[PDB]
Symmetry: C2
Subunit: 88 residues, 2 copies
């Protein structure tokens, strides 16, 4: 259940600069994230390789919101990676 | 571009009995589909090969609910196929 879920997200966490812009936008497209602010923050982290510290300052974001959002994208990325062999 | 979006969905529509349970649940996982009966109806169609008529009867769905739900999964399938190259060795 939920405890093992959180451990999987820790183990699969997306890191700073881990993807291209178009990949990022496709993940956003599949997601239910719709806040422009948190989209731009996650693009700066995941695509541009800015640090969490810098991104939180720029978007005036707290760690709960940053970490939750990053976890939502990590979850989607794990599911998409598991789906990929059905399409390749 | 809503009109073209609908045409694309027709061309791309998922077939009955076309995916494994694992593939199905991964697509459900990415989706925002919440209804337990709707997930079971889509499983019965996409995995178990039941007809549309069969699932709509079993899970009390009207045609618009079925068609819309299948459309939601067809869109995700197209998008996941466009994401897949980014998970390759290249």
């Amino acid at each position: 259940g939920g405890d093992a879920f959180l451990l999987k997200l820790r183990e699969s966490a997306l890191s700073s600069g881990s993807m291209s812009e178009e990949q990022f936008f496709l993940l956003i497209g599949i997601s239910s994230i719709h806040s422009d602010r948190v989209i731009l923050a996650m693009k700066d982290y995941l695509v541009s390789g800015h640090s969490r510290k810098d991104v939180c300052e720029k978007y005036q974001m707290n760690n709960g919101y940053f970490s939750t959002t990053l976890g939502r994208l990590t979850r989607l990325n794990v599911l998409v990676a598991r789906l990929a062999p059905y399409y390749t």
